[PDB]
Protein backbone atom coordinates (compact mmCIF):
# COMPACT_ATOMS: atom_id res chain seq x y z
CA UNK A 1 0.00 0.00 0.00
CA UNK A 2 2.58 2.56 -1.10
CA UNK A 3 0.02 4.46 -3.20
CA UNK A 4 -1.60 5.95 -0.09
CA UNK A 5 1.67 7.79 0.57
CA UNK A 6 0.87 9.87 -2.52
CA UNK A 7 -2.38 11.07 -0.94
CA UNK A 8 -0.82 11.55 2.51
CA UNK A 9 2.15 13.60 1.31
CA UNK A 10 0.07 15.57 -1.20
CA UNK A 11 -2.36 16.57 1.54
CA UNK A 12 0.59 17.50 3.76
CA UNK A 13 2.11 19.63 0.98
CA UNK A 14 -1.18 21.44 0.36
CA UNK A 15 -1.71 22.08 4.08
CA UNK A 16 1.82 23.42 4.56
CA UNK A 17 1.42 25.64 1.49
CA UNK A 18 -1.81 27.04 2.95
CA UNK A 19 -0.11 27.64 6.31
CA UNK A 20 2.81 29.43 4.63
CA UNK A 21 0.40 31.55 2.60
CA UNK A 22 -1.55 32.56 5.71
CA UNK A 23 1.66 33.41 7.57
CA UNK A 24 2.89 35.53 4.65
CA UNK A 25 -0.47 37.30 4.43
CA UNK A 26 -0.24 38.13 8.14
CA UNK A 27 3.35 39.36 7.74
CA UNK A 28 2.63 41.55 4.70
CA UNK A 29 -0.22 43.30 6.57
CA UNK A 30 1.58 43.96 9.86
CA UNK A 31 1.49 47.69 9.07
CA UNK A 32 -2.06 47.80 7.68
CA UNK A 33 -4.65 50.01 9.36
CA UNK A 34 -7.78 49.33 7.32
CA UNK A 35 -9.60 46.44 5.70
CA UNK A 36 -12.05 46.33 2.80
CA UNK A 37 -14.88 46.83 5.31
CA UNK A 38 -13.00 49.44 7.35
CA UNK A 39 -12.29 46.91 10.09
CA UNK A 40 -8.68 46.54 11.27
CA UNK A 41 -6.83 43.57 9.84
CA UNK A 42 -7.02 40.62 12.24
CA UNK A 43 -4.10 38.19 12.22
CA UNK A 44 -5.29 34.80 11.00
CA UNK A 45 -4.00 31.26 11.46
CA UNK A 46 -4.83 27.84 10.07
CA UNK A 47 -5.93 24.82 12.11
CA UNK A 48 -4.30 21.44 11.43
CA UNK A 49 -6.22 18.19 11.86
CA UNK A 50 -5.55 14.56 11.04
CA UNK A 51 -7.13 13.88 7.64
CA UNK A 52 -8.75 10.66 8.83
CA UNK A 53 -12.36 9.73 8.19
CA UNK A 54 -14.11 7.90 11.08
CA UNK A 55 -12.49 4.47 11.28
CA UNK A 56 -9.23 5.43 9.54
CA UNK A 57 -6.12 4.73 11.62
CA UNK A 58 -3.61 7.34 10.38
CA UNK A 59 -3.83 9.81 7.52
CA UNK A 60 -2.15 12.96 6.32
CA UNK A 61 -3.05 16.46 7.50
CA UNK A 62 -5.85 18.84 6.55
CA UNK A 63 -6.71 22.48 7.19
CA UNK A 64 -9.99 22.54 9.11
CA UNK A 65 -10.60 26.29 9.18
CA UNK A 66 -8.89 29.68 9.33
CA UNK A 67 -9.37 31.46 12.66
CA UNK A 68 -8.59 34.92 13.97
CA UNK A 69 -5.55 34.93 16.24
CA UNK A 70 -6.27 35.60 19.92
CA UNK A 71 -4.18 38.62 20.92
CA UNK A 72 -4.94 42.21 21.99
CA UNK A 73 -5.16 44.63 19.08
CA UNK A 74 -2.15 46.93 19.00
CA UNK A 75 -3.30 50.38 20.13
CA UNK A 76 -1.56 53.39 18.59
CA UNK A 77 -2.12 56.99 19.70
CA UNK A 78 -2.68 58.91 16.45
CA UNK A 79 -5.80 61.08 16.81
CA UNK A 80 -4.93 62.88 13.58
CA UNK A 81 -5.31 59.97 11.20
CA UNK A 82 -8.80 59.93 9.61
CA UNK A 83 -9.33 56.44 11.01
CA UNK A 84 -9.38 56.61 14.81
CA UNK A 85 -11.32 55.70 17.94
CA UNK A 86 -13.35 57.77 20.38
CA UNK A 87 -10.09 58.65 22.17
CA UNK A 88 -7.89 58.46 19.06
CA UNK A 89 -6.79 54.84 19.60
CA UNK A 90 -6.00 53.48 16.15
CA UNK A 91 -6.26 49.69 16.13
CA UNK A 92 -3.43 47.89 14.33
CA UNK A 93 -3.10 44.13 13.73
CA UNK A 94 -1.66 41.92 16.45
CA UNK A 95 0.92 40.29 14.16
CA UNK A 96 3.99 38.97 15.98
CA UNK A 97 6.69 39.30 13.32
CA UNK A 98 9.12 36.81 14.87
CA UNK A 99 6.37 34.21 15.09
CA UNK A 100 5.43 34.69 11.44
CA UNK A 101 9.03 34.43 10.24
CA UNK A 102 9.57 31.25 12.27
CA UNK A 103 6.27 29.88 10.93
CA UNK A 104 7.38 30.57 7.36
CA UNK A 105 10.70 28.80 7.92
CA UNK A 106 8.99 25.82 9.58
CA UNK A 107 6.42 25.53 6.78
CA UNK A 108 9.17 25.59 4.15
CA UNK A 109 11.15 22.87 5.93
CA UNK A 110 8.13 20.60 6.41
CA UNK A 111 7.20 21.15 2.76
CA UNK A 112 10.66 20.09 1.61
CA UNK A 113 10.55 17.00 3.84
CA UNK A 114 7.25 15.95 2.28
CA UNK A 115 8.74 16.46 -1.19
CA UNK A 116 11.60 14.10 -0.28
CA UNK A 117 9.06 11.54 0.95
CA UNK A 118 7.20 11.73 -2.37
CA UNK A 119 10.40 11.41 -4.42
CA UNK A 120 11.69 8.32 -2.63
CA UNK A 121 8.22 6.75 -2.71
CA UNK A 122 8.02 7.18 -6.49
CA UNK A 123 11.48 5.65 -6.86
CA UNK A 124 10.32 2.64 -4.83
CA UNK A 125 7.16 2.28 -6.92
CA UNK A 126 9.27 2.16 -10.08
CA UNK A 127 11.60 -0.42 -8.52
CA UNK A 128 8.58 -2.51 -7.48
CA UNK A 129 7.33 -2.30 -11.06
CA UNK A 130 10.74 -3.78 -11.97
CA UNK A 131 10.14 -6.70 -9.57
CA UNK A 132 10.89 -9.80 -11.63
CA UNK A 133 12.32 -8.19 -14.76
CA UNK B 1 0.22 -24.29 -3.34
CA UNK B 2 3.91 -25.18 -3.05
CA UNK B 3 5.05 -22.13 -5.03
CA UNK B 4 2.56 -19.93 -3.17
CA UNK B 5 3.86 -21.21 0.18
CA UNK B 6 7.53 -20.82 -0.79
CA UNK B 7 7.13 -17.16 -1.81
CA UNK B 8 4.71 -16.22 0.97
CA UNK B 9 7.18 -15.13 3.68
CA UNK B 10 9.00 -12.51 1.61
CA UNK B 11 5.77 -11.29 -0.01
CA UNK B 12 4.15 -10.77 3.39
CA UNK B 13 7.28 -9.09 4.76
CA UNK B 14 7.27 -6.73 1.77
CA UNK B 15 3.58 -5.90 2.28
CA UNK B 16 4.25 -5.19 5.96
CA UNK B 17 7.17 -2.98 4.88
CA UNK B 18 4.77 -1.04 2.66
CA UNK B 19 2.26 -0.58 5.49
CA UNK B 20 4.99 0.47 7.92
CA UNK B 21 6.23 3.03 5.41
CA UNK B 22 2.69 4.35 5.01
CA UNK B 23 2.57 4.77 8.80
CA UNK B 24 5.97 6.50 8.87
CA UNK B 25 4.91 8.85 6.07
CA UNK B 26 1.77 9.66 8.06
CA UNK B 27 3.98 10.45 11.07
CA UNK B 28 6.18 12.71 8.93
CA UNK B 29 3.14 14.49 7.46
CA UNK B 30 1.69 15.18 10.92
CA UNK B 31 5.06 16.31 12.33
CA UNK B 32 3.84 19.89 12.94
CA UNK B 33 0.27 19.06 14.01
CA UNK B 34 -0.22 19.92 17.71
CA UNK B 35 -1.37 16.97 19.78
CA UNK B 36 -0.34 14.03 17.59
CA UNK B 37 1.36 11.03 19.18
CA UNK B 38 3.69 9.28 16.75
CA UNK B 39 2.56 5.78 15.77
CA UNK B 40 4.64 2.76 14.77
CA UNK B 41 4.36 -1.02 14.59
CA UNK B 42 6.50 -3.88 15.86
CA UNK B 43 7.60 -5.41 12.57
CA UNK B 44 8.67 -8.86 13.78
CA UNK B 45 5.66 -9.67 15.98
CA UNK B 46 3.16 -8.42 13.40
CA UNK B 47 4.99 -10.32 10.65
CA UNK B 48 4.76 -13.59 12.57
CA UNK B 49 1.11 -12.84 13.36
CA UNK B 50 0.28 -12.30 9.67
CA UNK B 51 2.28 -15.44 8.90
CA UNK B 52 0.26 -17.72 11.22
CA UNK B 53 -3.15 -16.11 10.60
CA UNK B 54 -3.86 -14.52 7.22
CA UNK B 55 -4.12 -10.77 6.67
CA UNK B 56 -7.31 -9.14 7.92
CA UNK B 57 -8.87 -5.67 7.85
CA UNK B 58 -10.85 -3.61 10.33
CA UNK B 59 -13.50 -2.74 7.74
CA UNK B 60 -13.55 -2.55 3.96
CA UNK B 61 -12.96 3.22 5.23
CA UNK B 62 -10.54 0.30 5.50
CA UNK B 63 -7.24 -0.26 7.28
CA UNK B 64 -5.01 -3.23 8.18
CA UNK B 65 -5.39 -5.35 11.33
CA UNK B 66 -1.99 -4.22 12.62
CA UNK B 67 -1.52 -2.92 16.17
CA UNK B 68 -0.66 0.78 16.02
CA UNK B 69 1.62 1.32 19.01
CA UNK B 70 2.78 4.64 20.41
CA UNK B 71 6.42 5.68 20.21
CA UNK B 72 8.06 6.82 23.44
CA UNK B 73 8.77 10.58 23.19
CA UNK B 74 12.35 11.79 23.50
CA UNK B 75 11.89 15.32 24.86
CA UNK B 76 8.74 17.26 25.78
CA UNK B 77 6.97 19.81 23.57
CA UNK B 78 4.36 22.43 24.42
CA UNK B 79 2.11 21.73 21.41
CA UNK B 80 1.94 18.11 22.50
CA UNK B 81 3.19 15.90 19.67
CA UNK B 82 5.85 13.20 20.05
CA UNK B 83 7.03 13.15 16.42
CA UNK B 84 10.80 13.54 16.74
CA UNK B 85 12.10 14.16 13.25
CA UNK B 86 15.47 12.40 13.64
CA UNK B 87 13.74 9.17 14.66
CA UNK B 88 11.20 9.51 11.85
CA UNK B 89 13.83 10.05 9.13
CA UNK B 90 16.08 7.23 10.45
CA UNK B 91 13.18 4.77 10.47
CA UNK B 92 12.12 6.01 7.03
CA UNK B 93 15.56 5.37 5.51
CA UNK B 94 15.91 1.99 7.26
CA UNK B 95 12.46 0.89 6.07
CA UNK B 96 13.36 2.09 2.57
CA UNK B 97 16.49 -0.07 2.43
CA UNK B 98 14.69 -3.07 3.92
CA UNK B 99 11.89 -2.77 1.34
CA UNK B 100 14.50 -2.64 -1.44
CA UNK B 101 16.10 -5.73 0.14
CA UNK B 102 12.75 -7.52 0.06
CA UNK B 103 12.27 -6.59 -3.59
CA UNK B 104 15.76 -7.89 -4.39
CA UNK B 105 15.18 -11.20 -2.58
CA UNK B 106 11.78 -11.79 -4.18
CA UNK B 107 13.05 -10.90 -7.66
CA UNK B 108 16.05 -13.18 -7.20
CA UNK B 109 13.81 -16.08 -6.16
CA UNK B 110 11.45 -15.55 -9.11
CA UNK B 111 14.38 -15.46 -11.54
CA UNK B 112 15.83 -18.46 -9.68
CA UNK B 113 12.63 -20.21 -10.74
CA UNK B 114 12.30 -18.94 -14.33
CA UNK B 115 15.85 -20.23 -14.79
CA UNK B 116 14.62 -23.75 -14.02
CA UNK B 117 11.42 -23.52 -16.04
CA UNK B 118 12.92 -21.80 -19.12
CA UNK B 119 14.10 -24.27 -21.78
CA UNK C 1 13.29 21.06 15.29
CA UNK C 2 11.53 22.51 18.34
CA UNK C 3 14.50 24.45 19.74
CA UNK C 4 13.62 27.05 17.11
CA UNK C 5 10.36 27.60 18.99
CA UNK C 6 12.16 27.99 22.32
CA UNK C 7 14.47 30.60 20.78
CA UNK C 8 11.52 32.31 19.07
CA UNK C 9 9.71 32.54 22.40
CA UNK C 10 12.82 34.04 23.95
CA UNK C 11 13.11 36.63 21.16
CA UNK C 12 9.42 37.56 21.27
CA UNK C 13 9.48 37.98 25.05
CA UNK C 14 12.64 40.07 24.69
CA UNK C 15 10.62 42.27 22.32
CA UNK C 16 7.86 42.48 24.94
CA UNK C 17 10.37 43.45 27.64
CA UNK C 18 11.82 46.10 25.33
CA UNK C 19 8.31 47.44 24.74
CA UNK C 20 7.78 47.70 28.50
CA UNK C 21 11.11 49.51 28.94
CA UNK C 22 10.37 51.92 26.08
CA UNK C 23 6.95 52.68 27.56
CA UNK C 24 8.64 53.40 30.90
CA UNK C 25 11.18 55.70 29.24
CA UNK C 26 8.50 57.58 27.29
CA UNK C 27 7.03 58.71 30.64
CA UNK C 28 10.19 60.23 32.10
CA UNK C 29 8.29 63.54 32.36
CA UNK C 30 4.90 62.17 33.45
CA UNK C 31 3.89 63.70 36.82
CA UNK C 32 3.59 61.14 39.60
CA UNK C 33 4.47 58.04 37.59
CA UNK C 34 5.34 54.53 38.76
CA UNK C 35 7.62 52.47 36.52
CA UNK C 36 6.53 48.99 35.46
CA UNK C 37 8.92 46.25 36.55
CA UNK C 38 9.83 43.48 34.12
CA UNK C 39 11.02 39.94 34.76
CA UNK C 40 11.48 36.91 32.51
CA UNK C 41 9.87 33.88 34.11
CA UNK C 42 10.97 30.42 33.01
CA UNK C 43 8.26 27.85 32.27
CA UNK C 44 9.56 24.24 32.21
CA UNK C 45 7.66 21.98 29.83
CA UNK C 46 6.54 18.76 31.51
CA UNK C 47 6.53 15.45 29.68
CA UNK C 48 8.73 12.52 28.73
CA UNK C 49 11.36 11.33 28.77
CA UNK C 50 14.23 13.75 29.44
Amino acid sequence: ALLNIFDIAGSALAAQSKRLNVAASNLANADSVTGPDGQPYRAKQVVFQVDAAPGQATGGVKVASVIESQAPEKLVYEPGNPLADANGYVKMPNVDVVGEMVNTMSASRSYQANIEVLNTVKSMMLKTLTLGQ
Amino acid sequence: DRLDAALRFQQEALNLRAQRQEILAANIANADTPGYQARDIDFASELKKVMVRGREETGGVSSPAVDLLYRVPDQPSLDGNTVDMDRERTQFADNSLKYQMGLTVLGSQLKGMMNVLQG
Amino acid sequence: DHAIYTAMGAASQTLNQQAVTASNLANASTPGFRAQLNALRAVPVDGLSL
Binding site: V46, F48, I67, N103, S106 | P34, G35, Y36 | -
Partner: peptide
Protein backbone atom coordinates in the same frame (compact mmCIF):
# COMPACT_ATOMS: atom_id res chain seq x y z
CA UNK D 1 -7.98 17.32 18.14
CA UNK D 2 -5.17 19.09 16.30
CA UNK D 3 -4.93 22.86 16.65
CA UNK D 4 -2.96 25.81 15.31
CA UNK D 5 0.54 24.70 14.26
CA UNK D 6 3.74 26.54 15.02
CA UNK D 7 4.04 29.82 16.89
CA UNK D 8 0.65 30.04 18.61
CA UNK D 9 0.69 26.55 20.16
CA UNK D 10 4.39 26.67 21.13
CA UNK D 11 4.31 29.92 23.10
CA UNK D 12 3.27 29.76 26.78
CA UNK D 13 -0.51 30.12 26.65
CA UNK D 14 -2.61 31.97 29.23
CA UNK D 15 -3.66 29.85 32.24
CA UNK D 16 -7.38 29.60 31.49
Amino acid sequence: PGGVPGALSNQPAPPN
